[model samples]
Target: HMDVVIASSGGGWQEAQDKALWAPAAKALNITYTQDTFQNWAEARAQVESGSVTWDIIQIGIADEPQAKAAGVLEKLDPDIVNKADFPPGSVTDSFVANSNYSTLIAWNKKTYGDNGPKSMADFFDVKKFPGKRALWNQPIGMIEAAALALGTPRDKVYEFLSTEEGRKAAIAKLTELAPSVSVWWESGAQAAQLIKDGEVDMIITWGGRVQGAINDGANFAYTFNDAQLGTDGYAIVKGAPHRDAAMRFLKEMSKAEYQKDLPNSFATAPANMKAYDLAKYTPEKMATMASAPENVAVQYSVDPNFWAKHAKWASEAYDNVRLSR
Candidate 1:
């Protein structure tokens, strides 16, 4: 009965929003869906702080959720209305719920690497062993996490180590060591894919969807699931959303397995809902290549949003110092 506006930017959320929410809701409710590009975190934070947030629901990265919640810009999710139990435990949070799950994976040109491809983050950093132009994300989150893994920290201990000043320093050191081999520092998922497609970089750390897009478009790419960084983005309703009930309804509908199943085909990102894996659109082999798939899940390191939130500014400053010195 109420109109809802959802804002999302980057990755594959646009396709999911269109197919899963906009089209269906248009027929069922007198709703209006509008999308605006979230160019950077600064613009979003400014809008929220000014108390003039235009979108009822906004797609926030995991790293941004805690800060948004602390700032009191986002509303506490209503579990009863949204059916939190319907999703995997921990996927639904008070201020945000899982919108999509993706992995930062090492993808290579299949023709170039053949059977003996790089399998893990260590291999990703071992330029001498793997050898060739490599690309990694410019963001500190993936860089630090992947650096920790390459520096011999187990996946389970990654979040804990990153929480400390000394551990963070060590992680940055590892990243600095690998920087020379990295030919490109990609700013977005799309840019990462373009680097691979243009054969500008032989190996790159990129999101699952970007890698999948390049491969599907015949870019001669292949990705390994080993030691990937798993992360999620979620829907965070503004605290003073104009249509709270409509926003809640939109969350409930979007989390359904049926809606999740359509995501992979449309956007190439894996669905967060467990049951969505059973959908026939994802074949066994296709699932094997995806981040949320069972085979890859164990090997993938789950990123800690809270950890990133606490340390991101410090990490960014440290990284900037290193860049300036270089």
Candidate 2:
């Protein structure tokens, strides 16, 4: 029988998860692995409120973590299983265990840049220096923070600015800097990658993973983590999961540094287990590109799930209005 049913995004990282994460861990832990995708939390909540939760372990996004907790669809994580003190701060939470992390950052076509590519958010906003179409995630998750950074807000001051409508509008004002060159308001990681791959856009601010995925698919895009926004994806046990105990055991093994390494080459990730970094085999260029690498981490900011959870809706609406008005 399967140890647990893991609900995560499908197709993109499934092979890596199957080969790198699940198969090895299940063998060692003496359990079996079975997983499926759950794109929206409402699906999980439906099963939760119905008193028949089907999924045991969920791969939660930044915004959904708090919502799931408040709705009581999750179980309190066992400290013994999570190893909080060992992981990067904020990687471990009361109800979740972060196993992998990615960054939302800048990427540019290799040929489009001569040598000094757009390295910072300021460069992303400067159209004259790096001419051609620019694309940013259609979502506000990274756009607001990137806008704030470009407008001279300190990294420490970003979320506070994003927390207010005044700050959001101010950020939005700077976003208009690209109005003449803004070719695409990207709706998905793949769309952003494909656009840049085809040279349809010279630059994009998107997840490092999807860009790396593009590279794996033979695209020649390079990324920068300067002022990047860090985000973690983790597993949360469904409250009253049918295989709750097994799921907990699987998570405990999953969080180890040894198992989490090598995600970088496959998905441009930094393992949630901080120690996995020591085991990583990336070269100067590869290591430098990783969002969680020491060099990149110092300048990068972690995206606060709570902030997005709180303001993502209205900000999204406002952004949509602004997009349509143009």
Candidate 3:
């Protein structure tokens, strides 16, 4: 039997892969899959730089994936397997192929709040009345950008504003006021959804796939489109991976129309494979919420990998200080 390992952050994202993609495909391909957890690109970078890369196929943020590819740490994907014409436009990149198009946004639990709910990012920082435990994705881009959003900066200028010293502190200043209300800080997209369902967090910043996965699985949660950050999670082959040919074959298998269709069924995310979407059943309402939908995509922020790669260290340090101060 063929075997390979995947690295993911955690939770429904990983579980969805096992149930939706890997397990079913296993028998036909005579394959078995193992998994590893990675918190950030540094983990992936560390392995590549060390010349001891173990994980065959890895999931990375679209932004970070390009950065990793640029570092010469990833194997460029085969054009035939990740055929750009077969998938949605812009889904295939030089090194990795988009698995799903998703968003990092705010969400809340309906079971805890009833009909009235927080409407936007503005409510996440409001601690007086709808006061309770809140959560955020354990990263700085959203925190920095969201802080700008709170400080009356337009969404379009979020990244630009964060480049300045005054804008940086303003972001931290906003978080400093709101940090007292944050009860949980989420480390992974899937973990963010789990926290919401467990009632550990009243509100959260997470990938839309996580929220949709929760909703699909009967987690009483709801989210807003207001200021969602759009992104893609894609597959990358580790440089010098032991199972190179097999990993590429596996990536090809994942690209098949019938197989890729499972992504929406499991997480209700927008499938990157254009043909797969035709296999999926969708209503107008559900279609409207998808990150790849034209209307939704128009409103969401796109994280620039180059920008994040450049400023992420400073942002992380500032975010850590803010996190600790509260």
Candidate 4:
């Protein structure tokens, strides 16, 4: 029997992948699986460059793929093994296979606004219309996307515009306008959820997984996918993996609807494969809350990993300068 090392982020994500992908893949392939931790692509790149690649497969953020692709730290996925047609756009690529989709959107405390919580990205910025303490992620990618939408950039044109200097400037200025109302700049998904659940802020920019967890815990929060920024998470085989062939086969098994459908049973993200919805056991009420649902995905914009690779450094610094000045 072959052995495959699966590196994943801890907590719910690790558990979900263990149940939905790794365990099943191991069973199907008659392989032994060992779990490890994945922090970031840089760590994986270092291992690959030193010819000491130990992790066979590592979970990754899709937005970081363009950077890792350029670094040549990830193995190109096997198309013969992976059914590319089964996944949503951007979910399957040369170096990655996204297993789940999620969104960053505005959620407001229902206790503060009742049923009249801010309904649009623009509403999140219109302080006079929905005035209150607001929480925003400290990072630039999600914040930049949200600010661009709030300024009426068409969902499809957002990445195209952000590719330009003028558009980057415009996004920064818009965020500056809301800086006074931003009472907290959250650093983690867990922290964002805790803030919402504790009612520390009236409005927050957070992922559906985080906010929904808060809502389920009895926090009075409501959100919409209207103009939300959607992103994906999945596994990438480390370049020169010790068990390359077995890893690719495992990824192929992971991509199937049978395993993908169970991702949301452990967490709130949607499956990358559209067919998974057909087999998913989610209640209609639960499906309605998913970011990858037909209706939600239609309205939300996909995050552009290529743009992040090119501009994330400068954009992050520029965003911080403006945020600090405000």
Candidate 5:
């Protein structure tokens, strides 16, 4: 028997608990699982820095993964225990492996946009055509990627451009142009989902899973994968976790495609394992609505965690200054 803690945000913890803990634990050796919340990156960083890490297996965003590793908070992953080939190449990393993938896409009122809805990030900023209030997240990560796409930067070139001075300025300027129409700047996934449900904003840039949840609740929101920012959160073992053997067992179990297939149906989020795509449990129509679908997945731009981690402070400050000026 072993004891382990998992760090997750409020919006995602339930599903993580179910898939990464309960179901898997029931089938494996005796173990104890606990849940903890770190709503934002700042809090997660503080826990690492203070060496007060309550979690053994933490879910870390791609943008924060590099920092977590650099701080020596996360233990190096052992490939011998958890083979990387079981997962998609995109999901595995040196220190952390992808647990789930989600998209930051433009969610709009389906009743308003209809069949021929806005198709790209530029369309999300088109006030004249899709005339309605908008909601965007209050962070540079998603906004910079969206702005880069809106400013005519190619999807492949987005990260490269943003790493430069001129590219950074251009993205901020693009955001400034659309700032007047923004109805809300949401900080949490739930807040973004609530904004759509309340009809407070006709359009919002939010996580695909949150949008899926809103749609399930009979909200009129619909999302497109065009220019979407795909980010994967991973499970990393803390550097000095007491239950290292149990943690490894948990990671190995999570890597199984069969184990991941049930997650989308239960939680409305995409499983990271590529083999989970073939599960017949989720129908074609239902799969079409998911971020994991081939059509939607094809259009997504995967986030570069290392780059974002390296430049977070500078990018965040610049983004704030721009937003404040607006």
Candidate 6:
């Protein structure tokens, strides 16, 4: 009997995968399935380097794939088994393919701004126009991108700007300019959602799903996909895993449109497989909330893993210096 183990960022994520994709794919392939917690790349790289890759497939953030690939900790995808042509451009990589996409977007309290809340990345910083307490994620990547866009850096030139020393400093400086209005530096998506749900902050920059969850719970919140930073997370085969063949086939089955369309049944994320959008049982209202929806994708920026792989360290330290200095 074929058995496979998947490493995942646990809690609700694993539960969603278990019901929405993993368990179904495992059953379809007549394989036993197990899931374990995924800590970080260091542990995954250790398993691969030391010849002890216990996790056949691991769910990882697509933005980390470049680093993982650079470290040689991930296995190459079998193009024949998992067809890249069937997915969207950003969803496929040499070593990974995405299952879902989420967006880091702007949301504001309706009670605070009414119908005229901050509408664009630039507006998020226009204190005179939309004056209120704002919150941003405590992390660097999305913050850098948000600040860059807020400072009017062209969408296509965003990563190019951050790739240099002077440009990155400019982006950080934009953050410093708006630091006075930022009421919270949120550490987790849950905390960010809670801030909006309780109406503790007037505006927030956070993940779309988290903000949507708050709205679903009756919070008076509104968000936009305009200039949102899109991020993806998906399954990656651990290099040198014992059940590589079965794992690959499992990925193939899981990547199918039929299975992917069901992803929203358990989570708020949008399916990575483009065909899944047509096949999904989603109404117009619900589809509008999907980060990967074609219209939404058109307005948002996909986070480039390669850029981050190259400059994550420098940008992170720079972001820290700005945050800690205050």
Cα-based lDDT for every prediction: 0.74, 0.77, 0.76, 0.84, 0.76, 0.82
Q: How far is candidate 4 from the true structure (C-alpha RMSD, Å)?
A: 3.0
C-alpha TM-score for every candidate: 0.88, 0.82, 0.86, 0.86, 0.88, 0.84
Over 1-326, each residue of candidate 5 has an lDDT whose tens digit, in order, gives: 25576667666435644664456754675666776766566665566677776567777777877767777777888866556676667567777877677888988887777765678998988899889888888887788889899988888888899888898888888888899888778887877878878778878898887887878778987778889988887678777676766877777676667667776765667777777777546777667766657788788878987677778788788778766765
- Name the regions of candidate 1 deviating beyond 4 angstroms: 1-3, 11-13, 241-245, 275-281, 322-326
In the range 1-326, model 6's lDDT, one tens digit per residue, is 35698877654456777888888888888889877885455679888888777889988877778878888989998867667777777678878888988998999899999878988889998998998898986667678988889889887888988888888888888998888888888876667777887999999998787788778878999999988998998888988988998899899898888888887775578888878867766977778888878899888888988787997667767777767766
Which candidate tops lDDT?
4
Candidate 2 residue lDDT tens string, 239-293: 8899998888888887777788855556656677777767766677667656777
Better of 1 and 2 by lDDT: 2
Give me candidate 3's TM-score against the actual structure: 0.86
User: What's the CA error at residue 166 for candidate 1, in Å?
Assistant: 1.9
User: How many clashes in candidate 3?
Assistant: 0
Model 2 error, position 151 (Å): 2.3
RMSD of 5: 2.7
Better by lDDT, candidate 6 or 5:
6
What local lDDT does model 4 show for residue 163? 83
Q: Give the per-residue Cα lDDT of candidate 4 at 25.
A: 71
Q: Model 6: clashing residue pairs?
A: none
lDDT for 20 in candidate 1 is: 67
- Where does candidate 2 clash, by residue pair? none
